[PDB]
Amino acid sequence: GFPTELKPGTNQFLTTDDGVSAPILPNFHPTPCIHIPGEVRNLLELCQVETILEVNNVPTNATSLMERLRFPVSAQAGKGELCAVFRADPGRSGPWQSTLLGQLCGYYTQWSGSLEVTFMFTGSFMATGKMLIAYTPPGGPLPKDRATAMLGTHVIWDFGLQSSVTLVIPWISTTGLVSIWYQTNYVVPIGAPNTAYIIALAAAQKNFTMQLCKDASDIL
Amino acid sequence: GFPTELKPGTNQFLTTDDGVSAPILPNFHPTPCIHIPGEVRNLLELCQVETILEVNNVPTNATSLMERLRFPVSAQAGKGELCAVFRADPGRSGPWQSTLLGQLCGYYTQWSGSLEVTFMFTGSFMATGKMLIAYTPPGGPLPKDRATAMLGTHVIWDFGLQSSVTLVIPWISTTGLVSIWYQTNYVVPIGAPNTAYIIALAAAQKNFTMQLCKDASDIL
Amino acid sequence: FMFTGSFMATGKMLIAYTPPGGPLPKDRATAMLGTHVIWDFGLQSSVTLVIPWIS
Amino acid sequence: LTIGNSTITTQEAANIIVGYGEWPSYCSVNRFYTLDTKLWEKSSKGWYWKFPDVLTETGVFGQNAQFHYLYRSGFCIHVQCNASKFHQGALLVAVLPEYVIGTVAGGTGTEDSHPPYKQTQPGADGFELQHPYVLDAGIPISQLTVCPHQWINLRTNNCATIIVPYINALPFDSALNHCNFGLLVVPISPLDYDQGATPVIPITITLAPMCSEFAGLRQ
Amino acid sequence: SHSTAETTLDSFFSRAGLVGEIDLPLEGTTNPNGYANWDIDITGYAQMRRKVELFTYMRFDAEFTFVACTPTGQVVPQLLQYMFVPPGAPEPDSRESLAWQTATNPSVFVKLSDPPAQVSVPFMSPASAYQWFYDGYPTFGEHKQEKDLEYGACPNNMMGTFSVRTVGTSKSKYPLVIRIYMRMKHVRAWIPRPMRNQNYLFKANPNYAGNFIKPTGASRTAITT
Amino acid sequence: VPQLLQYMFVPPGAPEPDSRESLAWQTATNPSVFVKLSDPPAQVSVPFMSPASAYQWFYDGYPTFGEHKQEKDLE
């Protein structure tokens, strides 16, 4: 009635709208809110939790899934390469779609920040040896041996420390590569198991975040 | 619902409207704005930059465009007329559609203000001579010789100065004419080139501005 | 170094010094990597070179 | 700063020109680079250069700059053109940011595949413009002066300088991945001289960046 | 001047004009599947394209509108759909595709009897500002020898995609003709670039042809007035 | 009846349409509005477009503002 004509496009219906509707029950009183020990604020803190990562993917049998998530180590192999973790890109298929970080990033398009990983060793109390962690920046060719990787940012493993070995990637945004190499041969005392299995952990840093949502779904 | 009836013409759709629409993504956060050394404010400062002007347009061959933008000078011609720049009207075809000032004014209908031009000379260090710059106001007949043009506002060229010669038009709004004449013969020392080429520059003054936009396009 | 050209002449010149041990110079680019002196004809004889050490 | 016996004769009376009245910035040195002399001829039409990819072969620190990824420096570009007092000519020097090289698609069919490596690599010497009116890119030569430039006249000066900071497409910039800029030199008035005189005009360009960065990544 | 509002860069870019033209005839071969798609090609029209190369680095938003009409211009009781496709999201492939019901893709239900509705999209470019010229390789991948699937649609430059569909299992009864208009609210540029003046050869690639014309040839000789 | 009609203001500099399929219809610089006639009539306004300070219904001189006073000028 009051003189004012709204510009055309009054009844457009887009999902993003910040519209409020009249309640179907204008007299109901909602149940009181309680305090629960659990609490969630954003997706950032959920990315700040640690979760396991997988390397080996050779066997596919149903009763054989466990030896996928861990990779073996033997004393016979020396001065070479044990395992080469696939390219660093959590959104795409590879290592990171198994962990929580990649899957939640699966609901997003692009991301930027820094990533860090920590490594845990499961050898005997009487065992000793030396290990190498190799990181190469994107763009650079494939590593050849321990010497070429040692030129760049590398982490050397000491068995005087149990799991203090950790790596931090300054920036991630075509993709970087990380690998593991034998700095020295594996030596074991007599009367001890001749082989062990290795596991690793991963998480997200403070400055890691996503920007835009993606409509991605696979199953079902 | 509230009693008020908008006057007829509520859903008229005109392009000039200052309307704001609901974003298609009500939750996205735009990328942060950065500081860039380049910066643009209006069309006036872009008109305040210098750009070359063209006079000669005799040859049309593809490998012959360069001698268009400059005009030659020879010692044989004397006490006469070397070059007569076309009528002063940047919007229309002629001299000024080659430079930036006229082309941007091409997107506009009418303009008012003052214009200035500067001249540069490319002779040898051992050369000398005298030159004349002629401007006639609109309405007045065509100039006949150096004497008739000298009655009006004229600029005399001195070769003791390299490019200090400049001209300022008090007002432009059917069109004015400017020409170049030989005040004296061209004298050159022996052992030096017998001819030279001349170039000029143009720009817009502070008080030059346009008023109304025009829907003008030619190619493609 | 002193130059004895005409008053109307101009050009560019290069002075090359290589340290002992290093191979023979190939062109102006290789010598330019080391300590070199560039000659300007805006100066008459201001061009000079100093060897830090000789043994 | 001499490589053995590299002590050239340099000018001390350069004409100082500032760019936008703004000095370069910090993270977001005394080596003077030397290039091969250029010969200017009566029928010459002008040249062009592409940085930093072609720059990584002439400089002493430029040769190492092939392996350096990022840059942090200020550019003091010196262009020198020595000539006699009775020579005639005119030269233009300017910098065109984000200068995309225009490929030429001739023949009866107006369609070509990905740009050939022959066109992408003109060498460290430089290349000549096929049709310098359009800069071989369909861009009119009349409009270069809107960008930073300098006028070189034989009767007026023999040298010029240009100072430009780093302007890139992204706040985080890569020098070995993204082509930054290039230099354009084109004659406006063809050079003339008397019969029997020297027909070759030397051109030299000197620049002095500060430093670059290695970067590097691992898997 | 004192009243310089009409002379600013916003006013120099303040105009809604023709951007897209897509037709959906009742029967034919242009779209025998009942739907169509449109890529945002501002460079397609030389009118609006020639404006942008005056600068190299620029930022702009946009708003979009839709008009449905018959070849005679009558109004019919049917609905049409419009949705913005981000680069990550997949384009529809069939009329009964599962992409129509995807929740993460924003879509709106609109009745064309209602006078035309208009929607806007904010800054979607991951970079700080748009770059109409990328002095390098079109693909951002690590391979520089193959025909990658990401060629043409690079994440650093593309700004979205639209699709159109008439929803409903019952068959559509009317022909459709659709016209698209766009306009910008905020425009900001940093560095000027010399204006592109000579004739164009390709639709989105600045490559040119060997037949040279000059922008002007009206003036015969210097002596001639 | 269910149809739409177009209205646009033509400034003196802009060219008038010449055909039904003319390119002037899609010109961006010419303001035009899409209107449904079923909607009760819409109204638009134009502000002061005269380059001069005020209108003059009588021009004591020549109808043309050109420098020629003998021909049949297009203006």
Author numbering:
A (entry chain C), B (entry chain C): 1 to 173, 177 to 223
C (entry chain C): 119 to 173
D (entry chain B): 7 to 34, 45 to 235
E (entry chain A): 72 to 296
F (entry chain A): 147 to 221
Please quote the paper that reports this structure.
Enteroviruses particles are composed of single-strand RNA (virion RNA) genomes encapsulated by an icosahedral capsid of ~30 nm in diameter. In this study, we genetically perturb this equilibrium in a non-enveloped virus, enterovirus A71 to determine its structural basis. Using cryo-electron microscopy and molecular dynamics simulations, we determine that the thermostable native particles have acquired an expanded conformation that results in a significant increase in protein dynamics.
The three states (A1, A2, A3) were resolved by 3D class averaging and refinement steps. The proportions of A1, A2, and A3 in the heat-inactivated preparation were 67.4%, 19.4%, and 7.9%, respectively. These data suggest that the pocket factor must be dislodged prior to VP4 loss, and both molecules must be released prior to complete genome uncoating. We observed a couple of intermediates that suggest that the first step in particle conversion is the release of the pocket factor (A1 particle to A2 particle), followed by large rearrangement of the N-terminus of VP1 and release of VP4 (A2 particle to A3 particle). Finally, virus RNA is expelled generating empty particles (A3 particle to empty particle).
